[PDB]
A paper describes a structure:
Thioredoxin is a ubiquitous protein that is present in nearly all known organisms from archaea to humans. In its active site, thioredoxin has two cysteine residues in a conserved amino acid motif Trp-Cys-Gly-Pro-Cys, which is a defining characteristic of thioredoxins. Importantly, the lower pKa value of the N-terminal cysteine of thioredoxin promotes its existence as a thiolate, the reactive deprotonated form of thiol, and this thiolate can act as a nucleophile to combine with a protein substrate, resulting in a covalently linked mixed disulfide (thioredoxin–S–S–protein).
Here we present the first structure of a BsTrxA C32S homodimer at 1.5 Å resolution. The C32S BsTrxA homodimer has the expected thioredoxin fold, with a central hydrophobic core with a four-stranded β sheet surrounded by five α helices on the external surface. Importantly, C32S TrxA does indeed crystallize as a dimer held together by a disulfide bond between the two active sites attacking Cys29 residues. In addition, dimerization is facilitated by intermolecular hydrogen bonds and hydrophobic interactions. Intermolecular hydrogen bonds occur between the backbone amide nitrogen of Ile72 and the carbonyl of Trp28, and between the backbone carbonyl of Ile72 and the amide nitrogen of Gly30. The large hydrophobic residue Trp28, which precedes the catalytic Cys29, interacts with a shallow hydrophobic pocket on the other chain consisting of the side chains of Ala26, Trp28, Val57, Ala64, Val69, and Ile72. The crystal structure shows that the side chain of the mutated residue C32S points away from the intermolecular disulfide Cys29-Cys29 bond, forming hydrogen bonds to the backbone amide of Ala26 and the carbonyls of Ala26 or Cys29. The C32S BsTrxA homodimer structure described here, however, has the same peptide chain orientation as the NF-κB peptide. In the BsTrxA homodimer structure described here, only two of these loops are involved in the interactions; the third loop (residues 88–91) does not interact with the other chain of the dimer. Taken together, our present structural analysis of the C32S BsTrxA dimer indicates that the high-resolution structure obtained in this study can serve to visualize a mixed disulfide intermediate state in the thiol–disulfide exchange reaction catalyzed by the native enzyme.
Author numbering:
A (entry chain A): 2 to 111
B (entry chain B): 2 to 105
Write the structure that this text describes.
């Protein structure tokens, strides 16, 4: 379940755990190309990664609060802190690489 | 030899001969990808093709007048009539083909 955020909800939605946030807009015909990517990533990683989308056409205030100057821009957040920035289109493999830098490599069994 | 249009000059700049017009904005990263393509097109066929760019963030009137609803959008015009519309990114070869349908 990819979440649709609003200016009002963005903070809460992104504040906890590992989160990939997608700043996009219908007007940037392009930035839509990310949407199927997010679906594949949600299929593969959804247990460990919360995906949040925010349509910056409808939600005009969030971009400025995160220094988003062009769309699309994706962010990786851990516990509400931005830990990666990805400007422009990137394929599933590139975004998987970024997120994985912030997830456990090992799971120790005691 | 690409022309940067404004809302005021757009209709006049695209009114004659074969024209490729690019609707883009710095705010849209995919729209910027069109630029090197246009430079290559100009190098290849600049004597037969006029290329006009319009930054819709600084010139928002023109997008409405041409029914542009997302960016980028490219138009081919012949003597001021829109004869092809291309929504989204397309590579040089695809745009070259669109224009070539309107030469001669």
């Amino acid at each position: 379940a990819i979440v649709k955020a609003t200016d009002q909800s963005f903070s809460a939605e992104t504040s906890e755990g590992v989160v990939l946030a997608d700043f996009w807009a219908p007007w940037c015909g392009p930035s839509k190309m990310i949407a199927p990517v997010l679906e594949e990533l949600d299929q593969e990683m959804g247990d460990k990664l919360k995906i949040v989308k925010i349509d910056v056409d409808e939600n005009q205030e969030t971009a400025g609060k995160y220094g988003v100057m062009s769309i699309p821009t994706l962010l990786v957040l851990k516990d509400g802190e931005v830990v990666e920035t990805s400007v422009g289109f990137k394929p599933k493999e590139a975004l998987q690489e970024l997120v994985n830098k912030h997830l456990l490599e090992h799971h120790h069994h005691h």
